[PDB]
Design an enzyme around this catalytic site. Structure first.
Site, PDB file in Angstrom:
ATOM      1  N   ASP A  70       0.823  -1.200   0.000  1.00 54.16           N
ATOM      2  CA  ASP A  70       0.000   0.000   0.000  1.00 54.16           C
ATOM      3  C   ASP A  70       0.863   1.258   0.000  1.00 54.16           C
ATOM      4  OD1 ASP A  70      -1.919   1.899   0.300  1.00 54.16           O
ATOM      5  OD2 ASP A  70      -2.415   1.404   2.391  1.00 54.16           O
ATOM      6  N   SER A 108      -0.782  15.638 -11.988  1.00 52.20           N
ATOM      7  CA  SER A 108      -1.050  15.290 -13.373  1.00 52.20           C
ATOM      8  C   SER A 108      -1.301  16.547 -14.194  1.00 52.20           C
ATOM      9  CB  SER A 108      -2.247  14.343 -13.443  1.00 52.20           C
ATOM     10  OG  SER A 108      -2.673  14.095 -14.774  1.00 52.20           O
TER      11      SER A 108
END
EC number: 3.4.23.22
Length: 330
Positions: A35, A199
């Site tokens: 994770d 992004s």
């Protein structure tokens, strides 16, 4: 040194991925959920409340000659999906894919929430976010990656998750045969303890690319892609019959649909998520309403590039002095 381990989807939907991990002496192999959005290595154990164990493999520290109680240390964690676990702490030898760390904090669960009990395939979590998020008190502990880093050939790990197929976590090297083209690297903020990056935009299907900054985290422990409501609405508007359902808890779409792809930007590069990756199947067994793999982050407080996004790429988690993230197509 290096390590290389195969990671395998737990079910037919890729709800999560498990990777075998050797703990203790002689080795006890547990299948852990790696994770990159948390920083605790915790396991089902001989200490876990019996009624909260249902099929998991447990770590038994009394059977490990290298286990030592970390006296006075406790831990307690709550995840974004509302699940939680807590317990005490041992140090022991931990190996992943041939890479060994001695003195790793292994957090032994005394209690786990129902979602963990109900998932017989996940024996615990191995956190790979920054150690500043580790929950051990009163002495915070380091992640497996942080402990391994100095020994690694290169201070990196990579995630290469499969779509409905096994993939790989590598430590200490970049497998140049595992991706196509070049790797595009992008800046990371560690301010919130995550692999947080920005992004450069998105496209829906064959549509034009929208240049827009989307801050979010690369999180292998989250199944879906969670993005701003504007972006998500633009995606689902291209699917006939798709709608957001408060009763179901997100966007659903007709199971008869063919889903468009979704592209996200990494600098000037582009990663394309095929439409099929966005199908999470019937909302309930036999339903003709299907659950979407792109969902709104509104009210989460952060955008999350979870498995839906990451499995479309070869992803480099660069833990050099100034961390960065790399993405390549594959």
């Amino acid at each position: 040194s290096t390590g290389s381990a195969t990671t395998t989807p737990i079910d037919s939907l890729d709800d999560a991925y498990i990777t075998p991990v050797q703990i203790g002496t002689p080795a006890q192999t547990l299948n852990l959920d790696f994770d990159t959005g948390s920083s605790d290595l915790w396991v089902f154990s001989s200490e876990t409340t019996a009624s909260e164990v249902d099929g998991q493999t447990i770590y038994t520290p009394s059977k490990s000659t290298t286990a030592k109680l970390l006296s006075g240390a406790t831990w307690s964690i709550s995840y974004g999906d509302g699940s939680s676990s807590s317990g005490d702490v041992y140090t022991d030898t931990v190996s992943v894919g041939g890479l060994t760390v001695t003195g790793q904090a292994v957090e032994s669960a005394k209690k786990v929430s129902s979602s963990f009990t109900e998932d017989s395939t996940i024996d615990g979590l191995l956190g790979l976010a920054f150690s500043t998020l580790n929950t051990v008190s009163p002495t915070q502990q380091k992640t497996f990656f942080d402990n391994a880093k100095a020994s690694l050939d290169s201070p990196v790990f990579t995630a290469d998750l499969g779509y409905h197929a096994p993939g790989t976590y590598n430590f200490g090297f970049i497998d140049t045969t595992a991706y196509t083209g070049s790797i595009t690297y992008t800046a990371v903020s560690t301010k919130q303890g995550f692999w947080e990056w920005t992004s450069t935009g998105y496209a829906v299907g064959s549509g034009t690319f929208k240049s827009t900054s989307i801050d979010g985290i690369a999180d292998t422990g989250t199944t879906l892609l969670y993005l701003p409501a504007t972006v998500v609405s633009a995606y689902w508007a291209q699917v006939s019959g798709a709608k957001s359902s408060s009763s179901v808890g997100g966007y659903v779409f007709p199971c008869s649909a063919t889903l468009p792809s979704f592209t996200f930007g990494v600098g000037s590069a582009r990663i394309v998520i095929p439409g099929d990756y966005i199908d999470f199947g019937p909302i309930s067994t036999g339903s003709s309403s299907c659950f979407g793999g792109i969902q709104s982050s509104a009210g989460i407080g952060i955008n999350i590039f979870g498995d839906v996004a990451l499995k479309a790429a070869f992803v480099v988690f660069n833990g050099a002095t100034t961390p960065t993230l790399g993405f390549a197509s594959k």
